Ligand binder design. Sequence first.
Ligand SMILES: Nc1ncnc2c1ncn2[C@@H]1O[C@H](COP(=O)(O)OP(=O)(O)OP(=O)(O)O)[C@@H](O)[C@H]1O
Ligand SMILES: [Mg+2]
Lengths: 51, 378, 211, 40, 43, 50, 278
Amino acid sequence: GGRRFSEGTSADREIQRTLMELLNQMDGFDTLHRVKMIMATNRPDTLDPAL
Amino acid sequence: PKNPDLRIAQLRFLLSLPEHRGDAAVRDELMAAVRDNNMAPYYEALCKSLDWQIDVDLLNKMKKANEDELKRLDEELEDAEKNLGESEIRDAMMAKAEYLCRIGDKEGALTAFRKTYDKTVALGHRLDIVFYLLRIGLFYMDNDLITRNTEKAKSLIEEGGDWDRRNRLKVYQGLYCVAIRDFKQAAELFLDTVSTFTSYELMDYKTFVTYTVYVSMIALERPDLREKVIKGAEILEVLHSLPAVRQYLFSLYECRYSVFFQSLAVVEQEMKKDWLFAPHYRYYVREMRIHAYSQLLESYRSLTLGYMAEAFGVGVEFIDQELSRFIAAGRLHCKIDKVNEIVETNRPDSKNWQYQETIKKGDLLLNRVQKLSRVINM
Amino acid sequence: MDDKALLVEVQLLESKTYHALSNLPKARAALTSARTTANAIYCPPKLQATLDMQSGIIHAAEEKDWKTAYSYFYEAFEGYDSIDSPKAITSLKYMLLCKIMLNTPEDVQALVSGKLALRYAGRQTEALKCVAQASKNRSLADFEKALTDYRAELRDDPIISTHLAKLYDNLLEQNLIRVIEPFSRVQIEHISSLIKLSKADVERKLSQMIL
Amino acid sequence: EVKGVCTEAGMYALRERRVHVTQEDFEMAVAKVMQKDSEK
Amino acid sequence: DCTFIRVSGSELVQKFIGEGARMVRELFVMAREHAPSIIFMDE
Amino acid sequence: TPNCRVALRNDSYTLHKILPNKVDPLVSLMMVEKVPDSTYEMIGGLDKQI
Amino acid sequence: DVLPPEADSSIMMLTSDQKPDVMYADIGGMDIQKQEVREAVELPLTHFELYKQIGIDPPRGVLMYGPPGCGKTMLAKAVAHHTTAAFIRVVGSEFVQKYLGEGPRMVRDVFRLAKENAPAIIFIDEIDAIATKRFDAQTGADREVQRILLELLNQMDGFDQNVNVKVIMATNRADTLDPALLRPGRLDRKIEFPLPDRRQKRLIFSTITSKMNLSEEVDLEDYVARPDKISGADINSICQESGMLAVRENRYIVLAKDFEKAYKTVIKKDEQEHEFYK
Ligand SMILES: Nc1ncnc2c1ncn2[C@@H]1O[C@H](COP(=O)(O)OP(=O)(O)OP(=O)(O)O)[C@@H](O)[C@H]1O
Ligand SMILES: [Mg+2]
């Protein structure tokens, strides 16, 4: 999940791509039907507000 | 400068061609000829003038002042190259060659304009130089040099919008297409009359209104006169100051046929004394007569010829000899009878008359290419 | 002084009273001053549609672009929607008189059958349906009874009394191509007899068509 | 903002289907571009 | 006739100057090859 | 020239023919940034700073 | 031999069961942005000649941005429903394929498909997966993405103002963008979708609650009057939660007691507002 960054390391380049693929496949141009999602965390401080 | 320069060419026409009217025209032009440093364009005009025996000191006081402006150019060309701007020799006389364009002939202009054409990297000075070459090419009627730079003008406007260089340009072909006998282009180049500005050559906008209405009544029929020049508020209110031309346009529209010839006699007389219509004033009315005849004649079929005397124009035999020469001309589709005193019309299809113009052009292009292939290859 | 919003009202009120006192180019400028003033207020909540009405009145008062003038009377009615019933019901008149002036007479019934306009039933929307029906069947006499029935709301407005005479010419030739259609050579004595109109004026009006 | 206004004056001419930009479109363009100048 | 070069310190630009370009001064190798050049900088 | 393309046969890797002129990297740099190319003719009222 | 054009990603929006069937009347209260996206996308698509006739240089591409949940993805759905043009819909995190050189081949055949097909419309979403600021020419996973951006920045330059290809692009964070992408000639029109405050707020309640029962008496203006920074994506969930609150009670008609329990359930801000500051 993460939040986002001002692009510190090279690692979280391709994680935010992996994250933004998840955001689009939820509600981008597709009827998200009969597919329910359940998520869990210890701390929701570090979540992206777009999620 | 070339901005008051077209009135000179009208007054040269006002000098020579009205033969009795050559007294006040040789005075008010000489009022402007032997001032503002003009030297070249009036030697043969002085030959068409009287003697004017002592012009020698009249020339010497002016060719000196021609040299005075020419020698301070000769004092500029070394102080501009020492500490250079954007070639400030050329850049000084890229505005002072238009003086030399007015003062000298085209040769000082053409070798300096094509000089300074390669100087400025932006067209905003180039395309203004091209308007100078167009304007002198009208004075010397350079009908082969205007064909070059008009394309060289129009090739510049596409980058940028340049509507003060496009709508300005449309007036130049609009005056050129009416210089030649091409009226369906001239009304089309005069289509706007909205962005057309209070210019230098038609210093009255209302004179431009007279020129765009005299050509519009030829080029288009009446589904378009009854929408464009009867309903334009841009064109109604400017002839609202004109009693004659408002009446001259509307008499054809209101079907007031008798008073149509009355003001047409005024305009055709005026068209004779006007410059640039006098090459084709006799072509105008004979097209405007046959335009006026066929409009009335295509409404009816069984019209008698003596009805047109007291309602269209007086003189029964005057109607007789005039319709006799236009059916014999191959136009004005009707067939006049004589001894039962009636005019019968027909309606021919749009095939034979459309066929007739095709066999003209087919002969003409075959005349062109047969004559060509004999000249080339020995 | 402090205000800006009340300047919009008094410029709009002068825009009313140069037009109603018959001075169009002075009313044109006073509208434009209210145009450039209302472009700065953050909240024009109701005065926008009031300006949108006479944005269409004066622009249709010279009869240049009826299509864009129709667009003003639509928005002036959308602003008058469900908040001001006297101002809304007259806004149906100016959109459908324009639409008959646009010469799409069937679309008048298509709007008033719509559920937004089914709510605003009344006398004056019936004054438009009968005239749109009169121009639908394309007849002169069908137009005349609709004028006499609803005269209290048809021939009472100060712009309708200007726009009826131009609409009469369009519907004169609309029935005139209707009855002339089914045939060949014919007498002039019957077409005057089938319109209930004279012969000399019809013959000149027939002559204008072929010109 | 001069190129902001003179470009936007075409948008008033284009939204009423005209082919010539008129002097009342410019003054309507000033009251919107200076409105955003009056915003923050 | 000056090669108007502006620098912004971007990184799409970076592959054409050098692989790491540990200084900024490596820009001058392309600058002294278009010799009458002008370097420009924004705010 | 240094930094110029070529053609190249593949059996022996023999030089074949000069392949023209590809790009200078400085030319591609300004092509990315796209500065608004201007002139004196579009300067509005800055005569003393010129 | 030469070929007809071809791509895999995406194909052409198959036009039958592909429109997301949202109309302009669904999006309530976006009067500036619904009007202004028309002038930049489909009005130059159809009425191309007036832009040519006045000479005002119609915009090549448009960048729309703002906080999340402001109808960014939604307004693109309604444009694709009422268009007459071809619509090409790509997700902007699929250019990072495993094999090298797939991505630059994947970029250039989108616009070639946007060339051959139609006067079409390109829609790219989450450009932050592609267009960032910082790079690192040591990894290879970052050497690839640098070649991705140099393709579409090259390919948007290869237009001649004659083909009618419009590029709509939508992001969430405009800060993480290279300003090389926002030069005129490439992206000139910038539309923010700011957050609705009160005037646009009551219009959203009208369009959402038009479908449900909402018995007769329940007021909606009493909720527009309050402060506190509500998006457009949760006014839907005010109504989406409260319907479930009524269905839970086996009661198929919305009451006014349901909206009170549902309003304080969605937003859940505390105060953050120690009052002694003022
Ligand atoms: N008229 C409206 N205005 C704003 N939001 C609305 C409106 N109607 C519904 N919504 C809700 O807003 C939600 C967000 O839609 P959309 O995905 O377009 O927003 P977004 O700005 O793209 O957010 P993100 O970028 O995070 O996806 C929709 O799921 C919908 O439930
Ligand atoms: Mg989105």
